Amino acid sequence: NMRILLAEDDLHLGEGLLEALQKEGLIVNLVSDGEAAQTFIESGLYDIVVLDIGMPIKTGLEVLRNIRNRGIKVPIILLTARDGLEDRIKGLDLGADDYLTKPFELKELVARIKAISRRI
Amino acid sequence: NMRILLAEDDLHLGEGLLEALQKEGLIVNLVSDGEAAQTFIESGLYDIVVLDIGMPIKTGLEVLRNIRNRGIKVPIILLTARDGLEDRIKGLDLGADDYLTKPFELKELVARIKAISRRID
């Protein structure tokens, strides 16, 4: 069925989103560094991807760029603490489907994942 | 320190294993189906793998077979059962390095993980 990849180095945001999305019946996997995130996006196992811009090894923007250049279409939501409209546009222009800033309430991100889920 | 994979049909939310294992230096990644578990294992990014025997799609034994035949040598801990004695023997004969009764405690799992660490360094 449908699979969601969460790439967040923050453990507590990771587990919270895990519990919330698994409470909605969805299948959710969790990684915490860009190397793993990119590896498993390029594998085509995932239908939606949530990606933290601040990750070890490779950053969310490095990964977003890379996978898009490999021709993968998967929708990608970026998470970030960068509170600058300048960075938001640049993430959207790099290939992102949505863009959330921290702090956010989990129920918003859940709603955006479900809205994306309808168009796929 | 090292990356560990947990492939389990039952995810233990509300117990906070992530911080516990992370405080032991173990950076965790989570999956819940055999197909994704096999792909993660094949990536070679993990130093220890905890593999549930009864996963969807591909069971833990299928995954174990395929990745060992793929030449992947990562140490693996199987999550079996209580009367799964033949699952222990068979699982070990297929290349698994340890067992763990399915209703386990975080304490026993962490102990067996760090105890599997002494077969490399």
Query: What is the DSSP code string of A96-116?
Result: -SEEEESS--HHHHHHHHHHH
Nearest to B55 by CA among B86, B90, B31, B28: B31
Is the Cβ pair B35, A43 closer than 8 Å? no
Domain ranges, ordered by start, for chain A: 1-120
Q: Does A14 touch chain B (CB under 8 A)?
A: yes
**Radius of gyration (Cα) for chain A, nearest Å?**
13
Task: Answer yes or no: are the C-beta atoms of A18 and A86 closer than 8 Å.
Answer: no
Chain B residues closer than 8 Å to A18 by CB: 11, 13, 30
Q: Indicate the CATH number for domain B1-121.
A: 3.40.50.2300
According to CATH, the superfamily of the domain at A1-120 is Response regulator (3.40.50.2300)
Is the Cβ pair A36, B29 closer than 8 Å? yes
Number of Cβ within 10 Å of residue B41's Cβ equals 24
**Closest partner residue to B29 among A28, A31, A45, by Cβ?**
A31
Q: What gap in Å lies between CA B121 and CA B107, rounded to an integer?
A: 22
Q: What gap in Å lies between CA B28 and CA B58, rounded to an integer?
A: 21
